[PDB]
């Protein structure tokens, strides 16, 4: 809406430890003592990370 | 107690106002530190892919 | 195309 | 390397604690001498009312 | 790996971790997901 | 006819109470000010209620 | 005057060091993300 | 028993002695440093857990 | 006088942590090496 900083996806992807990795998601999925609702939130955040990385390219 | 002590120093001391000397502004510790740091600041990769 |  | 850095931090901490003690002492002394300064200034600026 | 595996993943040899991770990536990629039904069935 | 209200007009519509400055003193600074005002030689912290009416209202 | 100079120089050195280290961290983070994405892409291509 | 208000330089000492202003700035800079170091510690731990 | 003493103590305090920054700077070299190794692997797997 503002159109001030074009390199916003790169700056967001450069923030250290702002997203979970692949193997952490994997360990969450294989560990059976977890709730489905937390799985869903981590899945949404992971999809957001992937979409940002795609739009960067 | 502290007001008593301050007024005692002011009024009950028999020293003329001239003979009171000035004290230091810099202890010798800070002078040594400042000289050492002046020396050490007188001695003083673009993201390779 | 076999990859995609 | 994690263990080494933890070691160096634990070695560096005591001097910092000592210097914090000294800093608090100096701050208290500054408060006391500011009290005295305000006293003497009030007396010198209007002596009769101050007394 | 056994010929039933290296057919699915283009890898002759790897740790158990690699095989498990790739099989899970496979069932997620084809939306077979906690029940899963296919090619892994007839191959394995 | 006479007209009057039960309560007085709030406190901010009074012509004397018009904002010139907001006093946003933090909590630690307020504690420091309280310590400085109690630790003064010429402190008025114990005037008493019968010697000053403003102290009584407060 | 020397004291004022030394304080100013100290604050400058501190903020310069912090800026440099933060730039390094951001570079490393973006690089990790890129490597992860590339390896996932290769794995998916092999499977397909 | 030390009180958190000991470290406050009220408002008028700092305009009687301007250097006190700068002193506060130094204090704040130190805070920044500390936080940065803190983050680094956390970061390193995470990387180990990853590796 | 007391203000100058305070400033000296605070600068002495800052110097120690400014020195402690260097080891945390070395862990960055560790991470850089590990990233290059992961890149080795990705390259060779792509060629395979």
From Swiss-Prot, chain A:
Localization annotation: Nucleus
Tree of life domain: Eukaryota
Complex and partners: Component of the SWI/SNF global transcription activator complex. The 1.14 MDa SWI/SNF complex is composed of 11 different subunits: one copy each of SWI1, SNF2/SWI2, SNF5, SNF12/SWP73, ARP7/SWP61, ARP9/SWP59; two copies each of SWI3, SNF6, SNF11, SWP82; and three copies of TAF14/SWP29.
Function of the protein: Involved in transcriptional activation. Component of the SWI/SNF complex, an ATP-dependent chromatin remodeling complex, which is required for the positive and negative regulation of gene expression of a large number of genes. It changes chromatin structure by altering DNA-histone contacts within a nucleosome, leading eventually to a change in nucleosome position, thus facilitating or repressing binding of gene-specific transcription factors.
Family: Belongs to the SWI1 family.
Domain notes: The prion domain (PrD) is a Gln/Asn (Q/N)-rich domain, which is unstructured in its native, soluble form, and which forms a parallel in-register beta-sheet in its amyloid form. The first 37 residues of this domain are sufficient for aggregation, propagation, and transmission of the [SWI+] prion.
This protein's name: SWI/SNF chromatin-remodeling complex subunit SWI1
Organism: Saccharomyces cerevisiae (strain ATCC 204508 / S288c)
Gene this chain is encoded by: SWI1
Shown part of the complete sequence: 1258 to 1314 of 1314
UniProtKB/Swiss-Prot annotation, chain B:
Source organism superkingdom: Eukaryota
Residues the record lists as Phosphothreonine modifications: 48
Subcellular location: Nucleus
Quaternary data: Component of the SWI/SNF global transcription activator complex. The 1.14 MDa SWI/SNF complex is composed of 11 different subunits: one copy each of SWI1, SNF2/SWI2, SNF5, SNF12/SWP73, ARP7/SWP61, ARP9/SWP59; two copies each of SWI3, SNF6, SNF11, SWP82; and three copies of TAF14/SWP29.
More about this protein: Present with 2900 molecules/cell in log phase SD medium.
Function description: Involved in transcriptional activation. Component of the SWI/SNF complex, an ATP-dependent chromatin remodeling complex, which is required for the positive and negative regulation of gene expression of a large number of genes. It changes chromatin structure by altering DNA-histone contacts within a nucleosome, leading eventually to a change in nucleosome position, thus facilitating or repressing binding of gene-specific transcription factors.
Protein name: Transcription regulatory protein SNF6
Protein's organism: Saccharomyces cerevisiae (strain ATCC 204508 / S288c)
Gene behind this protein: SNF6
Swiss-Prot record, chain C:
Residues forming coiled coils: none
UniProt-annotated location(s): Nucleus
Subunit-structure text: Interacts with RTT102, SWP82 and the N-terminus of SNF2. Component of the SWI/SNF global transcription activator complex. The 1.14 MDa SWI/SNF complex is composed of 11 different subunits: one copy each of SWI1, SNF2/SWI2, SNF5, SNF12/SWP73, ARP7/SWP61, ARP9/SWP59; two copies each of SWI3, SNF6, SNF11, SWP82; and three copies of TAF14/SWP29.
Role summary: Involved in transcriptional activation. Component of the SWI/SNF complex, an ATP-dependent chromatin-remodeling complex, which is required for the positive and negative regulation of gene expression of a large number of genes. It changes chromatin structure by altering DNA-histone contacts within a nucleosome, leading eventually to a change in nucleosome position, thus facilitating or repressing binding of gene-specific transcription factors.
Leftover remarks: Present with 3150 molecules/cell in log phase SD medium.
Protein name (record): SWI/SNF complex subunit SWI3
Gene name, Swiss-Prot/TrEMBL: SWI3
Range covered out of full length: 778 to 781 of 825
From Swiss-Prot, chain H:
Subcellular location: Nucleus
Quaternary organization: Interacts with SWP82. Component of the SWI/SNF global transcription activator complex. The 1.14 MDa SWI/SNF complex is composed of 11 different subunits: one copy each of SWI1, SNF2/SWI2, SNF5, SNF12/SWP73, ARP7/SWP61, ARP9/SWP59; two copies each of SWI3, SNF6, SNF11, SWP82; and three copies of TAF14/SWP29.
Protein family according to the UniProt entry: To yeast RSC6.
Function summary: Involved in transcriptional activation. Component of the SWI/SNF complex, an ATP-dependent chromatin remodeling complex, which is required for the positive and negative regulation of gene expression of a large number of genes. It changes chromatin structure by altering DNA-histone contacts within a nucleosome, leading eventually to a change in nucleosome position, thus facilitating or repressing binding of gene-specific transcription factors.
Protein name: Transcription regulatory protein SNF12
Organism: Saccharomyces cerevisiae (strain ATCC 204508 / S288c) (Baker's yeast)
The encoding gene: SNF12
